[PDB]
Design a protein around this motif. Structure first.
Motif, short mmCIF file in Angstrom:
data_model
loop_
_atom_site.label_atom_id
_atom_site.label_comp_id
_atom_site.label_asym_id
_atom_site.label_seq_id
_atom_site.Cartn_x
_atom_site.Cartn_y
_atom_site.Cartn_z
N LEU A 63 -7.39 9.15 5.44
CA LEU A 63 -7.55 7.78 4.93
C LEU A 63 -6.88 6.80 5.89
O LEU A 63 -5.65 6.94 6.15
CB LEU A 63 -6.93 7.75 3.55
N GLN A 64 -7.71 5.91 6.46
CA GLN A 64 -7.33 4.73 7.30
C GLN A 64 -6.72 5.11 8.64
O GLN A 64 -5.79 4.37 9.05
CB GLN A 64 -6.40 3.87 6.45
N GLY B 171 0.83 -1.20 0.00
CA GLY B 171 0.00 0.00 0.00
C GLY B 171 0.86 1.24 0.00
O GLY B 171 2.07 1.10 0.25
N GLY B 172 0.26 2.39 -0.29
CA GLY B 172 0.99 3.67 -0.33
C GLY B 172 1.72 3.97 0.97
O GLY B 172 2.78 4.53 0.91
C1 3KK Z 1 -3.32 4.91 -0.27
C2 3KK Z 1 -3.69 3.53 -0.83
C3 3KK Z 1 -3.61 3.58 -2.37
O1 3KK Z 1 -2.70 2.55 -0.36
C4 3KK Z 1 -5.12 3.15 -0.33
O2 3KK Z 1 -5.37 2.45 0.64
S1 3KK Z 1 -6.43 3.89 -1.28
C5 3KK Z 1 -7.90 2.94 -0.71
C6 3KK Z 1 -8.86 2.52 -1.86
N1 3KK Z 1 -9.38 3.71 -2.54
C7 3KK Z 1 -10.36 4.47 -2.00
O3 3KK Z 1 -11.04 4.10 -1.01
C8 3KK Z 1 -10.63 5.81 -2.64
C9 3KK Z 1 -10.42 6.98 -1.65
N2 3KK Z 1 -10.50 8.26 -2.34
C10 3KK Z 1 -11.66 8.86 -2.58
O4 3KK Z 1 -12.72 8.48 -2.05
C11 3KK Z 1 -11.61 10.06 -3.52
O5 3KK Z 1 -10.28 10.21 -4.11
C12 3KK Z 1 -11.96 11.41 -2.87
C13 3KK Z 1 -13.33 11.33 -2.17
C14 3KK Z 1 -10.87 11.80 -1.88
C15 3KK Z 1 -12.04 12.45 -3.96
O6 3KK Z 1 -13.16 12.12 -4.85
P1 3KK Z 1 -13.75 13.32 -5.73
O7 3KK Z 1 -14.40 14.38 -4.88
O8 3KK Z 1 -12.66 13.73 -6.68
O9 3KK Z 1 -14.96 12.53 -6.43
P2 3KK Z 1 -15.12 11.56 -7.68
O10 3KK Z 1 -16.56 11.11 -7.60
O11 3KK Z 1 -14.01 10.59 -7.79
O12 3KK Z 1 -14.96 12.69 -8.85
C16 3KK Z 1 -13.75 12.72 -9.65
C17 3KK Z 1 -13.91 13.74 -10.77
O13 3KK Z 1 -14.85 13.27 -11.80
C18 3KK Z 1 -15.90 14.21 -11.95
N3 3KK Z 1 -17.15 13.50 -12.24
C19 3KK Z 1 -17.98 12.85 -11.34
N4 3KK Z 1 -19.03 12.28 -11.90
C20 3KK Z 1 -18.87 12.54 -13.26
C21 3KK Z 1 -19.66 12.20 -14.39
N5 3KK Z 1 -20.79 11.49 -14.34
N6 3KK Z 1 -19.19 12.60 -15.59
C22 3KK Z 1 -18.05 13.30 -15.66
N7 3KK Z 1 -17.23 13.68 -14.68
C23 3KK Z 1 -17.71 13.28 -13.48
C24 3KK Z 1 -15.91 15.04 -10.66
O14 3KK Z 1 -16.51 16.30 -10.78
C25 3KK Z 1 -14.41 15.12 -10.35
O15 3KK Z 1 -13.77 16.05 -11.18
P3 3KK Z 1 -13.39 17.56 -10.74
O16 3KK Z 1 -14.67 18.46 -10.57
O17 3KK Z 1 -12.57 17.44 -9.47
O18 3KK Z 1 -12.62 17.94 -11.99
#
Ligand code: 3KK
Ligand code: 3KK
Ligand code: 3KK
Ligand code: TPW
Ligand code: TPW
Ligand code: TPW
Ligand code: MG
Ligand code: MG
Ligand code: MG
Ligand code: MG
Ligand code: MG
Lengths: 574, 572, 572
Positions: C112-113, C27-28
């Motif tokens: 996160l976590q 993981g990261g």
């Molecule tokens: C660290 C590691 C890797 O080891 C881990 O453990 S990661 C764990 C597993 N992954 C996760 O649980 C994910 C955790 N992260 C997140 O939940 C998200 O990154 C965040 C909540 C922190 C941020 O999400 P956003 O607020 O960016 O929301 P999204 O729904 O992903 O939207 C992304 C983009 O698409 C856009 N969007 C959403 N619905 C859309 C649609 N229908 N059509 C077009 N674009 C769309 C949205 O506006 C946005 O663009 P922008 O305005 O920032 O430019």
């Protein structure tokens, strides 16, 4: 032929069979069933004014005698009143057993009288903290807890057991009352491996300036094997607050006034039952810039902390010291460094001790606290034998002056690595009841004294022949001085010119006030003839202890003291 | 805003949150905050034992409703608070303890006083944290303050500690947010009308409704409670934590009929009150006829031991008023309440009269009830008991105090935790909060020895307290259990100590009383010369109500023998 | 030395401490360490579930004596280890788990976590810490490594986590001390001669001495143990954690006489073994004639349930040798040991022979004992069982395995914790430790479904394992308890799953067996094509010894009905 008896009877019997002849505590309903059984067996009950003090008295008893001691306290505030004293015993690694009351099992979590999570509060600062819910297993749990207090499955320190009152009253059938759990057990004696003994002797032969620093584990021995190693090694010797009295003051190795010179220059630091905590500069290369390191202990709590040994011996320390002494049979040690320190130490310590008898009053016209130690030194071989005396110190500036002013004592106790203010009176009571033949002398700050002053009553009711000498400087003065010097604002560190002699007399002890330093010898003589007694010495605020000068009050980033911190800051920028 | 150290921002947070005094005992680990409070004009009330500082905070919050603050150094400074923290946790009193702790670089290395403060306090706090991020300290303080009120838990103590290197770190101005510095109002959740209606229906169907108050009711001024008593015809009991809400002359106030009310009520309504051991666990054994309704602003006073046929989670004043409004057009049946009130008048009046003439015990010493008799006799002469804060502490003395203290503006005692030694620290907190009138604390000698040196604090800070000691040379409720039930008294005797002399040794006015006829005079002189102590030489031949009911025995199921007997019969 | 990030120094600490492989799942939060290990040439064994990585570490340490290392990311990466950590804690196996965790600035803010990893693991670790001081990380690693060995506790797992901002911080070279980087020898406390003499005296007085071995004995090579057996005339039992120390042909080795030895011994000598439920709590009910002596290098194997008339705290080899030396000139009385050995020879030989011909159950499917029969028949043909690491897991399958697995270099199983799902992860750790020979894991189908996807790990990392599944379409020891003792079977049936197909889907060799005569062939082909799985369609009509003795019922006092019956009689 055992019979069916209540858990409370079996617990009283377990304690007496394990060599407990006294229990410190404060009675409540939750523990009365045990209290009653202890009294009927002839176990002495030493009842106190504050449960914290009962655990301090147990602590002093175990530290002095090597017999695990026992405090018994009721549910709720009885148990919570013990946390400071438990933490202090945990820090100092002193075996002791706290027996708490707690509510009956049927009422668990229902808000019965005094249902707080005693075991969760105490778990972080005990070797074991349990609620005993099976009547037939209480003896077993007691015996295992007693062993864990000695350090089994952990390291030496306090344990906590509580027995719901319904369980205390439950009968245990005789078949389940096993002799092996009731009987006293000997201490463990793990032995050194001869390869490690050889390896340390080789390091000593190759060292030019070996130094031994003792602690708790060394103080569990009589000092004779330590002396054999000092003789065979040519090592210089320092003790700490927890290991005074092992090496005769006149021994060629005993260089107590050369602490800095030993740490600066030793090329071979040998810890004996001693942590390299803040009291020895974390054992940092900053504070021991030349030292290779060897660690000897019966617990890895005195082997792995902060510095690792080139060799580490996990064994009974007396056996380890004797084995290394034997391995140095045909070694002729190079004593020139030790001998040069000893020549300078003789003069520095003798000049210091002499000057205690005539220290001037501060600018406020009050007694310098050093005059208390001067007065005690003058009475030695007159009305008391300091060499047979248990000496206790407590407070801030008073405690730091005490460390230099107390040089002859059979045994020494103080506030500990924990800096636990208020131990003086409870410690003196535990010490005096352990060793009834001689007065015990406790010197305390007025600040520290206010925490446990009402235990003067306990000393009187139980006839503990203590002498408490109060450095009454109307202040938490080491703190007042840090405020004034480093903030230009003194606030909430002043106390008043309280009549501590009058407090002592109000609780039926002898009490006298001293304002003239010439009266001190007389006042201490009268206190010793009329113990339990308090001498309330009106002392100066214009006096900085060594601890005061070294920034103890400031709490630097890396080390407890400024000089050591400055050395650590330099070490980080190499 | 400028860049300032964490220590300054903490001082500012406190003052902005309405803190005008901090109780504590100075050490190096907290000096940076200590200094900043003094420079801001926050009063520092320094004590002899850190436990007492937390007791003082407790009394301040319980009386005023303003969250109070204790500040203590690392190691033994923090561990000295554990009893007083536990007592506040049991009583559900918002308060903040700020501890010192070692710098981050020295973690786990055996620096001076590195013990696990947060692990020790976690089980008896709403929050216990070490704050390692300078820029987030303000946020953590504000969130902890909200949790002390009951947010994400229930009301009670919180603990925050800041390693000394972090205390000394600067915070940039952009990270110092007004919303975390500013004082916040208390929450005010409102009742749902369907729950209000369902309680009013239960009251209309009940022949012998009874209201029992606790902590949450005591956070109100009592007026909404009196409206519901008027609209319901309910009998009224308070508890130690809810005295002074209903005038003694109110037709519902039947304080000498506790057993009769619990035995016979067909509708128990708890108002901000736990059904803990103080109310027989709410057991059907103790309330054999009662349907149950629970009203509180915290489920800590809704779900414990008995569930309501209705439970209202709301600001209790609003809930009480809403139910009173819903009983528009109800004619309550008061005949049971009135029959209890007639019996109460006789029993309580005969009891209070008898306080002035209680005989000496067989040992020739004063019966402690004469202390309450003397205070009753001075009322309207040299003090107004109706404006006085009264405190009780001890064993037999505490139980006698529960009956003997009938007029007080406010009452404090050892609490559900049975915390001996609160009297003097509580009296000091009370007196500094309400500087216009002496505070009177009546204490056992046993309890007093725990915190006696705080007499010094009272003198140095000029807290106008009068402490009256029941000096019976004993932990007497315990000595009496031993003598009666084991035929062996051991380790429960104290001595004939000069507590007046202890008080004078710390610069307080002091007097000893052996003759009960001297009590009025001695208490008069103590009130005129506060801070003052009256040391009363009392009898060992006097059993309190608590003594007679087996409090000291600790039965299997209930705190008292009679209730335990009823519980054993219910169980078969 | 130069200034390098904490992440580099951690990689170096591990390699210098003798770590040549790390088990985990990336993981990261741990990538900075992950990267540094790979650049140093430490092998990374990446898994499908972090629990399996800790199981693999456990197997490595238990077999090799070298402390092993698992590395997992924050939140679910750490929480996925809790079972495997608990299992190592129960079994007292040194191992280090390195967890990721959020940066310090975001503490308590819902990064996160951010869950309390250290609070979750504290009760089942020797140490669980968050490392917030970059310069002290090396020190903390070395001290934790010592505590994993048993220093300041007893042998077992430790947990360390480093916030990601700290991982990225530089440490100056002066703070990077050789003494913390370097590998350390194990401790070797020696016996006291008076304790050695007192044990020899007890042996001389005993007519039926018996030695029972455990974990601590299994850390030796067995030669000192055999010397004491020769000098004492004692009978010998091992446990699941101490197999392979004494040749089967040794006159003391009476493994089919477990009950007879415990019933009749007059001197029980435990060697690095707990008297937990696996030995009847050491109760006089189970050892009615036995004096007790305990030998171990940890009081975890000295004080539990029974105390020794002598207890030796020492390196067990040294203690065994010293007692053997002290029995110079003793002629042991072997008549009891020899009478057990004669009965053992018949019972064990008849049992092992019967494995080759056990009948199908009433449902027409293979009796699982035929799997052990087939392995016995291949010995000296296509594999040397004497050089083979054997693993067992499941319910009835595990109990049958305890009797059916008699030659193995080393044995692992579910442990005192009864940890189902260890078979595959243990087999992988074992195979990578000892790459020269296939490792054979025999498992229940229930147990296998927990860690089946680690077949993928075995294939990707080329671990030569053979997994044999007792596919009885059931949690069968549980199904059998339900049917027998409740007349209601519910939620204990599984299906006739294609475990061969699961194995092939992850690139392993796979074969299904329905005819018991096909087992030798199938196991031969699996050994030639490891990693490989043999899916054996087994009967539900087969009760293991554990089944017949009420293991599934959980009696009040003992794990098994017969022992519980004896405990009830002792108690009256
Ligand atoms: C660290 C590691 C890797 O080891 C881990 O453990 S990661 C764990 C597993 N992954 C996760 O649980 C994910 C955790 N992260 C997140 O939940 C998200 O990154 C965040 C909540 C922190 C941020 O999400 P956003 O607020 O960016 O929301 P999204 O729904 O992903 O939207 C992304 C983009 O698409 C856009 N969007 C959403 N619905 C859309 C649609 N229908 N059509 C077009 N674009 C769309 C949205 O506006 C946005 O663009 P922008 O305005 O920032 O430019
Ligand atoms: C932070 C705060 C204030 O809020 C607290 O909570 S503080 C808690 C209460 N106080 C304590 O518990 C004290 C804690 N501190 C210490 O224990 C010590 O400061 C230390 C262990 C860290 C350092 O002690 P030292 O190693 O300096 O030992 P001391 O016995 O005090 O020796 C002081 C000096 O006197 C010297 N000395 C000792 N015995 C002598 C003798 N007999 N004659 C002359 N000089 C003597 C000694 O050599 C040394 O001088 P030097 O060589 O460094 O120049
Ligand atoms: C276990 C041990 C000893 O080790 C401890 O730690 S004890 C800890 C120290 N003590 C405490 O913390 C007290 C604990 N106990 C209690 O709080 C109480 O016993 C109780 C809440 C559980 C029970 O109290 P009651 O409901 O009996 O309330 P009181 O106010 O004490 O009233 C007693 C009696 O006097 C009556 N009464 C009240 N005010 C009166 C008045 N003014 N005149 C006449 N009678 C009056 C009242 O009705 C009742 O009589 P009855 O109706 O049951 O017949
Ligand atoms: C329970 C506790 N609270 C605070 C502190 C912190 C402290 C360490 S030293 C000191 C002053 C002691 O004053 P004393 O009057 O005894 O000595 P002197 O300087 O000669 O005037 C304080 C307040 C400690 N360690 N323990
Ligand atoms: C900290 C603590 N330790 C023990 C106890 C147990 C107790 C409850 S009541 C009592 C007697 C109190 O004696 P006092 O002299 O104050 O009262 P009196 O009966 O009138 O003579 C004790 C010892 C409690 N609750 N708290
Ligand atoms: C993680 C866990 N969950 C439940 C259980 C409880 C259990 C012990 S034995 C058993 C049956 C195992 O079935 P398997 O198919 O492997 O064996 P067999 O009897 O030969 O058909 C269960 C469910 C345990 N110990 N661990
Ligand atoms: Mg206290
Ligand atoms: Mg613990
Ligand atoms: Mg002072
Ligand atoms: Mg009393
Ligand atoms: Mg199965």
């Amino acid at each position: 032929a055992r019979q069916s008896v209540p858990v409370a009877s079996l617990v009283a019997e377990f304690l007496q069979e394990h060599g407990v002849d006294r229990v410190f505590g404060l009675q409540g309903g939750h523990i009365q069933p045990i209290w009653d059984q202890l009294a009927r067996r002839g176990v002495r009950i030493v009842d106190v004014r504050d449960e914290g003090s009962a655990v301090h008295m147990a602590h002093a008893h175990t530290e002095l005698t090597g017999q695990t001691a026992v405090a018994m306290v009721t549910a709720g505030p009885g148990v919570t009143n013990t946390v400071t004293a438990v933490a202090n015993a945990s820090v100092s690694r002193i075996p002791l057993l706290v027996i708490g009351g707690c509510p009956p099992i049927p009422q668990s979590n229902m808000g019965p009288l005094q249902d707080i999570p005693h075991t969760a509060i105490l778990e972080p600062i005990t070797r074991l903290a349990r609620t005993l819910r099976s009547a037939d297993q209480v003896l077993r749990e007691f015996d295992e807890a007693w062993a864990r207090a000695s350090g089994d499955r952990g390291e030496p320190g306090p344990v906590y057991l509580e027995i719901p009152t319904d369980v205390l009253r439950r009968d245990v059938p005789p078949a389940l009352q096993m002799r092996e759990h009731l009987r006293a057990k000997p201490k463990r004696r793990p032995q050194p491996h001869p390869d490690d003994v050889a390896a340390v002797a080789d390091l000593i032969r190759a060292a030019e300036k070996p130094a031994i620093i003792s602690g708790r584990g060394a103080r569990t021995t009589d000092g004779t094997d330590l002396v054999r190693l000092l003789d065979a090694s040519g090592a210089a010797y320092l003790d700490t607050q927890e290991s005074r009295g092992l090496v005769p003051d006149s021994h060629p190795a005993a260089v107590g006034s050369a602490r800095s010179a030993v740490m600066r220059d030793t090329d071979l630091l040998i810890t004996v039952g001693r942590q390299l905590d803040y009291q020895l500069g974390m054992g940092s290369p900053a504070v021991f810039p030349h030292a290779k390191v060897v660690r000897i202990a019966d617990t890895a709590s005195e082997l792995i902390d902060n510095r690792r040994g080139e060799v580490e011996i996990l064994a009974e320390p007396g056996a380890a010291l004797a084995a290394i002494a034997d391995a140095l049979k045909d070694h002729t040690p190079d004593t020139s460094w030790r001998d040069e320190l000893k020549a300078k130490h003789r003069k520095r310590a003798e000049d210091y001790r002499q000057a205690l008898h005539s220290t001037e009053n501060g600018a406020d016209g009050h007694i310098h606290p050093n005059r208390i130690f001067g007065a005690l030194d003058a009475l030695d071989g007159d009305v008391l034998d300091l060499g047979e005396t248990i000496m206790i110190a407590d407070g801030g500036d008073l405690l730091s002056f005490g460390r230099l002013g107390i040089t002859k004592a059979r045994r020494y106790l103080d506030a500990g690595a924990f800096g636990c203010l208020g131990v003086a009176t409870p410690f003196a009571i535990g010490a005096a009841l352990a060793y009834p033949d001689r007065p015990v002398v406790a010197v305390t700050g007025d600040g520290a004294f206010g925490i446990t002053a009402t235990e003067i009553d306990t000393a009187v009711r139980h006839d503990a022949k203590i002498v408490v000498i109060v450095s009454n400087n109307r202040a938490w003065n080491i703190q007042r001085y840090d405020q004034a010097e480093n903030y230009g604002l003194v606030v909430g560190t002043d106390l008043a010119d309280s009549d501590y002699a009058g407090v002592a007399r109000a609780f039926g002890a002898h009490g006298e006030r001293v304002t003239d330093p010439a009266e001190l010898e007389g006042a201490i003589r009268r206190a010793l003839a009329n113990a339990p007694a308090l001498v309330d010495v009106v002392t100066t605020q214009d006096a900085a202890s060594p601890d005061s000068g070294k920034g103890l009050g400031f709490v630097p980033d890396y080390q407890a003291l400024t000089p050591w911190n400055d050395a650590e800051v330099a070490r980080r920028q190499e």
